[PDB]
Design a protein around this ligand. Structure first.
Ligand SMILES: COc1ccc(-c2ccc[nH]c2=O)cc1C(C)(C)C
Ligand SMILES: [Mg+2]
Length: 557
């Protein structure tokens, strides 16, 4: 029951890999300790190969079979539709990996003959053959981090032709089914602001609240053939077209169960017997499996009045505390049950009695004050990775602007407002790129966003409180300050000074740019302007946002 078996061939790159931080004229205004910032390359893939290769022991009890019975019952109410080639072709990101059949993502999007004719022949083969393993490509990811070096994470994905067919058969399923099965526990249905409301309300709902979070050591590699087979039966509970049932069955047996791994040089690297990281069902199947395992473990641990919040492998549990001594024991049992379900932890969970202490999605809840001085809870995180990645994005244009994603999702935070908003609006002003659409990742999906619509966007997911946040917790300010010292980032006083200029340059331009300067940079000036609800904020067509997660799913909205 090994996750992977390797022939010997190496995980080869598709190009020359840049590991050191590229420097330009704008770099030093943000970061000075360039050596601390790096990117991962195929040279450290062998380390991760060793880390992701292990044997899986799974023991399934009555708690497991009970939860699944309930899950299949809720799943039976779902009616899902098949997607047309055209619909699936428009969901493909513009820079998605090109086919080994002589066409790219842009040919797929333009609905070219070579692309559409190939998509049709792959679909026909999926309905006619349900046994032959589908070929996947194994690659080492190029991600930017700060030191204290991590080995490169792997990405396993099928051909562009298979990916369009996956969307056709399972896009509606992976988008609709998770909320029906899990209700209010599906985290991807929440905006950052709505997620806080849920956590705070849930914490307040308990007499003596206890909370903890769970992180699985290599979740994708812990996923067994049984787990993937169990996910298929959940999808098969839906009311589906006959063509969609055969395509799901086929994709399961040929792609999702496992298959061979191929490098950039066309060599067989080995065989995969766990979850593929770069398929449409990556996020859905991980959330369902984690939820099934954790719900049954919650029962095994005899945890009182549980409230789960799942998104991929990330899980948060808020319940009624039975005393510190019993609470430590309950969590030991939870861990032991999860381990038997083929999901051991990275670090053992610990009971927490303060919401600000729970860490999930590399984040935590913190307290700040709004304009009136009323306490307001918001979601934050350590700025080290966002800043290291913003530093890379200062010197090089990338397909996913992390800074933009971070400004959208962490808008109320001290670091995103003072550093990110200031630095990039200063660049967009200078380069006259204020009206240019930029791509960013939100819950694993790719979105083209206009930087001028940022104030309206921030109001819908955080409310007017985000533009008025002050008097941050001592611990948060200390975390930002230590991080700036570590990376050689100018202190927050220099950022205040720059923000007044950015604000002034923005206000001068009028229209949407003045609204940007007015709302986003009100914190910089002493003579504050009245920030009222933006009429434009309500008009925003945010349909498609916070519906589901698509990490590794190759989705574009
Ligand atoms: C499941 O929760 C998340 C997943 C991703 C991001 C995220 C953070 C930054 C950029 N893009 C993203 O999608 C943020 C969150 C919360 C916890 C802050 C809501
Ligand atoms: Mg994990």
């Amino acid at each position: 029951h090994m996750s992977y078996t390797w022939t010997g061939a190496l995980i080869t790159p598709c190009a020359a890999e840049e590991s050191k931080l590229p420097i330009n004229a704008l770099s030093n205004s943000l970061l000075r300790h360039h050596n601390m910032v790096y990117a991962t390359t195929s040279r450290s893939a062998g380390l991760r190969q060793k880390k992701v290769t292990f044997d899986r022991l799974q023991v399934l009890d009555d708690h497991y079979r009970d939860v699944l019975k309930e899950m299949k019952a809720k799943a039976s109410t779902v009616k899902a539709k098949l997607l047309s080639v055209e619909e699936a072709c428009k969901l493909t990101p513009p820079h998605s990996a090109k086919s080994k059949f002589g066409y790219g993502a842009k040919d797929v999007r333009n609905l070219s003959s070579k692309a559409v004719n190939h998509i049709h022949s792959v679909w026909k083969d999926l309905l006619e053959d349900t046994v032959t393993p589908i070929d996947t490509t194994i690659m080492a990811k190029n991600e930017v981090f700060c030191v204290q070096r991590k080995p490169a994470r792997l990405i396993v994905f099928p051909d562009l032709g298979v990916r369009v067919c996956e969307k056709m058969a399972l896009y509606d399923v992976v988008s609709t089914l998770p909320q029906v099965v899990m209700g209010s526990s599906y985290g991807f249905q929440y905006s950052p602001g709505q997620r806080v409301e849920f956590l705070v309300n849930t914490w307040k709902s308990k007499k003596n609240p206890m909370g903890f979070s769970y992180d699985t050591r290599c979740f994708d590699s812990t996923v067994t053939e049984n787990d993937i087979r169990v996910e298929e039966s959940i999808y098969q509970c839906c009311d589906l077209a006959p063509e969609a049932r055969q395509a799901i069955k086929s994709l399961t047996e040929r792609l999702y169960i496992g298959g061979p791994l191929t490098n950039s040089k066309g060599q067989n690297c080995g065989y995969r017997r766990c979850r593929a990281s770069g398929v449409l069902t990556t996020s859905c199947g991980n959330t369902l499996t984690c939820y099934l395992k954790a719900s049954a473990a919650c029962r095994a641990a005899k945890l009182q009045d549980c409230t789960m919040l799942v998104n991929g492998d990330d899980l948060v549990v808020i319940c009624e505390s039975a005393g510190t001594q019993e609470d430590a024991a309950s969590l030991r049992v939870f861990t032991e049950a999860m381990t038997r379900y083929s999901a051991p932890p990275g670090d053992p969970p610990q009971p927490e009695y303060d919401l600000e202490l729970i860490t999930s999605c590399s984040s935590n809840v913190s307290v700040a004050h709004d304009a009136s001085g009323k306490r307001v809870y918001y979601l934050t995180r350590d700025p080290t990775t966002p800043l290291a990645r913003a530093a890379w994005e200062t010197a090089r244009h990338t397909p996913v602007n992390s800074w933009l994603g971070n400004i959208i999702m962490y808008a109320p935070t001290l670091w995103a407002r003072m550093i990110l908003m200031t630095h990039f609006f200063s660049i967009l002003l200078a380069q006259e790129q204020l009206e240019k659409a930029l791509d960013c990742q939100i819950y694993g999906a790719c979105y083209s966003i206009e930087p001028l619509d940022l104030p309206q966007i921030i109001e819908r997911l955080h409310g007017l409180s985000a533009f008025s946040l002050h008097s941050y917790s001592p611990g948060e300010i200390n975390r930002v300050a230590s991080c700036l010292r570590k990376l050689g980032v100018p202190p927050l006083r220099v950022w205040r000074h720059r923000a007044r200029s950015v604000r002034a340059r923005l206000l001068s331009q009028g229209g949407r740019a003045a609204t940007c300067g007015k709302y986003l940079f009100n914190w910089a000036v002493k003579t504050k302007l009245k920030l009222t609800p933006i009429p434009a904020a309500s008009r925003l067509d945010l349909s498609g946002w916070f519906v589901a997660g698509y990490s590794g799913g190759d989705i574009y909205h």
